[PDB]
Amino acid sequence: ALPLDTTWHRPGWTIGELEAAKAGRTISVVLPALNEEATIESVIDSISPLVDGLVDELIVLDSGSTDDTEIRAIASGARVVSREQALPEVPVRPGKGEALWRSLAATSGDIVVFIDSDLINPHPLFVPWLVGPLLTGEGIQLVKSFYRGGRVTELVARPLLAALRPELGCVLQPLSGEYAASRELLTSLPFAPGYGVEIGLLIDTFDRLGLDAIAQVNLGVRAHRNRPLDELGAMSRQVIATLLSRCGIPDSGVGLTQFLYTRHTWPVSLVDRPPMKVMR
Amino acid sequence: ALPLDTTWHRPGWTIGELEAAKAGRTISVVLPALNEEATIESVIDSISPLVDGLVDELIVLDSGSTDDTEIRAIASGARVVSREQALPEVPVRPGKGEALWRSLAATSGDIVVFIDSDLINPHPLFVPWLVGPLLTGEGIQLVKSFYRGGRVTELVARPLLAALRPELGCVLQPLSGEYAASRELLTSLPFAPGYGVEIGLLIDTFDRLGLDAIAQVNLGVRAHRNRPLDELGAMSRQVIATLLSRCGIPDSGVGLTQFLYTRHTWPVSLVDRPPMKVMR
Ligand SMILES: O=c1ccn([C@@H]2O[C@H](COP(=O)(O)OP(=O)(O)O[C@H]3O[C@H](CO)[C@@H](O)[C@H](O)[C@H]3O)[C@@H](O)[C@H]2O)c(=O)[nH]1
Ligand SMILES: O=c1ccn([C@@H]2O[C@H](COP(=O)(O)OP(=O)(O)O[C@H]3O[C@H](CO)[C@@H](O)[C@H](O)[C@H]3O)[C@@H](O)[C@H]2O)c(=O)[nH]1
Ligand SMILES: [Cl-]
Ligand SMILES: [Cl-]
Ligand SMILES: [Mn+2]
Ligand SMILES: [Mn+2]
Structure with a gap:
């Protein structure tokens, strides 16, 4: 391991050991989904055998899908929750971050696990491997995954971290959609x-609790939707805007423009949601 | 055109018109080269027919090649200049920026044109298309190329510019290796x-002279060496470090690290060369 608790190899914990270690703590799993009809069922099926055992709760957070995502998820026995149902007093905004934030209001596990719903044949041990350090460690509140090409990660996020928060240089997949954390932590951010x-x-976790509160676990290899370069451009822009803000640097608020030769401007947002705590 | 003088179409200027417009101004062409034996001859040949006419001078700036780059360039009738010969009083540093800076000491054109030496079948009109706005415009001191996938450009540089210098959002290929500028400008930066x-x-040009001093010309389509993702990681890191500095933001000076699972750290530099002017 580096100064960051890193599980480099297959975790050795059995499902039954992990379950014992819960000690009254509950576990929620959240799958955010926007138009993932092709892969959603495989993801749900990889995890539903854990329900009522290690996992106390599983939801699909449907983020405005207009394909068959919701019906197929229901048919896999999953509870499907719209953004509106998760938190109906608050009008819905677009984007992934909104979905995860809302999901805090629709779950009650002491521990929350996020898994992207566009994964191609995910391992059924993904969730156990992620909760290991939270269950059996001390002071770990956040566990990130890594894997084996991560264009935004390797060209934008990791190099920017080295520039502005080099202490986080040891995190191999900072943008990974698969991770777990305590409710106490998540509803405080x-x-x-x-x-x-x-x-x-x-970055908020690190700034608030330091590295010793963070672990990372090998999930082996991952496959997912490969988006077009232009969609990555918009993603990178928002990652930059958010990263700059945590480092105390003013962002123009100006969206990325691209010339296809026609021109298009993508949205960027400088507005965070507050800690879900204030919503109590 | 946008607020930035953009030549969207094939320039209409003939080689003879352009030559007339020089009016005593001279033109140097510089080809930086590090291990480009496969493509260097095609690039030189695309340009050497202009020599003693529109172009007064052509050099290859050899950046430490250990392949056959230099012998093949010589065999194409080009003057080849090492980093050491360009400026022998000053010990040589690694990297592209060093080569271009040194090239200022090895040329005397009032106008300097840069063309990357790894281009696959470059158009022989590249150089005329670039000098057009400098020759026939007023107040243009810098001309950048654009073209038709530019991973570092679209994920790192363009989105970062939108964040920190949105006025430059209209520049389509800020990282393009093909461009031209006045000696007065270049030796002042x-x-x-x-x-x-x-x-x-x-950014320095813009900060010092504003947009009205900058033009961009369509070179159509370009092909070149596609580097591995890891090499791009190091490139992006240096682009970020340099970009952050011009915007008044402190860079850690810490190199990008990558885990292949073995680990490697790439060099990054926070040291600029001064204006070549001080070397007079
Ligand atoms: O508005 C949205 C957008 C995405 N998603 C879901 O979020 C997951 C990941 O989104 P994706 O479009 O696949 O993003 P990636 O290109 O894969 O981006 C990677 O890097 C991002 C930057 O941190 C992370 O947000 C992602 O989890 C990670 O997979 C998917 O299951 C989507 O269904 C939503 O629910 N709502
Ligand atoms: O140490 C070096 C490195 C590169 N080069 C030359 O510079 C040119 C471009 O370098 P390259 O390795 O092909 O970089 P790219 O991946 O193509 O990077 C693109 O984006 C960069 C970031 O601005 C620019 O420097 C490049 O010109 C542009 O082609 C080539 O002809 C090389 O021979 C050197 O002379 N010395
Ligand atoms: Cl608090
Ligand atoms: Cl000056
Ligand atoms: Mn994905
Ligand atoms: Mn190249």
Whole structure:
């Protein structure tokens, strides 16, 4: 391991050991989903055998899907929750960060696990491998995954971290959509909008609790949707905006423009959601 | 055009018109090269027909090649200049920015044109298309190229510019290796090290002379060496470091680390070369 608790190899914990270690703590699993009809069922099925055992609760956080995502998830026995149902007093904003933040209001596990719903054949041990350090460690409040090409991660986020928060240089996949954390931690932190949510959570956690509260576990290999370069441009812009803000640097608020030769401007947001705590 | 003089279409100027417009001004062409034996001859040949006419001078700036770059360039009739010969009183540093800066001491054109030496079948009109606005415009001191996937450009540089210098959002290929500028401008500016040199030159030019001094011309389509993702990681890191510095933001000076699972740290430099002017 580096100065960051890193599980480099297959965790050795059995499902039954992990379950014993809960000690009254509960576990929620959240799957955010926007138009993932092709992969959603495989993801739910990888995890539903854990329900009523290690996992106390599983939801799909449907983020405005217009395909068959919701019906197929229901048919896999999952509880599907819209953004509106998760938190109906508050009008819905677009983007991933909004979905995860709302999901805090729709779950009650002491521990919350996020798994992206666009994964291709995910391992059924993903969730156990992630909760290990939270269950059996001390002071770990956040566990990030890593894996084996991560264009935004390797060109934008990791190099920017080296520039502005080099202490986090040892985190191999800071933008990974698969991770777990304590409710106490998550409901105490703001949530960046859009694709800024992961990078925001990591830096805030570090700034507030330091490295000793963070672990990372090998999930082996991951496959997912490969988005077009232009969609990555918009994602990177939001990651940059969120990353700059945590480092005390003013962002223009100006969206990325691209020329296809036609021109298009993508939205960027400088507005975080506050800690879900204030909503109590 | 946008607020930035943009030549969207094939320039209409003939080689003879352009030559007339020189009016005593001279033109140097510089080809930086590090191990480009496969493509260097095609690039030189695309340009050497202009020599003693529109172009007064052509050099290859050899940046420590250990392949056959120099012998093949000589065999194409090019003058080849090492980093050491360009400026022998000053010990040589690694990276592209060093090569271009040194090239100022090895040329005397009032106008300097840079063309990367790894281009696959470059158009023989590249150089005329670039000098057009400098020759026939007023107050233009810098001309950048654009083209048609630019991973570092679209994920790192363009989104970072939108964040920190949104006025430059209209520049389509800020990192393009093909561009031209006045000696008066170039010898008045510092040169960022490594791959930071292009982004550094653009921001300094803008900060010092504003947009009205900058033009961009369509070169159509370009092909070149596609580097592995890890090499791009190091390039992006240096672009970020240089970009952050021009915007008044402190960089850690810490190199990007990558885990292949073995670990490697890449060099980054926070040291610019001063304006070549001080070397007079
Ligand atoms: O508005 C949205 C956008 C995405 N998602 C879901 O979020 C997950 C990941 O989104 P994706 O479009 O696949 O983003 P990636 O290109 O994969 O981005 C990677 O890097 C991002 C930057 O941190 C992370 O947010 C992602 O989890 C991570 O997979 C998917 O299951 C989506 O269904 C939503 O629920 N709502
Ligand atoms: O130490 C070096 C490195 C590169 N080069 C030359 O510079 C040119 C471009 O370098 P390259 O390795 O192809 O960089 P790219 O991946 O193509 O980077 C693009 O984006 C960079 C960031 O601004 C620019 O520096 C480049 O010109 C541009 O092609 C090539 O002809 C090389 O021969 C050197 O002379 N010395
Ligand atoms: Cl608090
Ligand atoms: Cl000056
Ligand atoms: Mn994905
Ligand atoms: Mn190249």
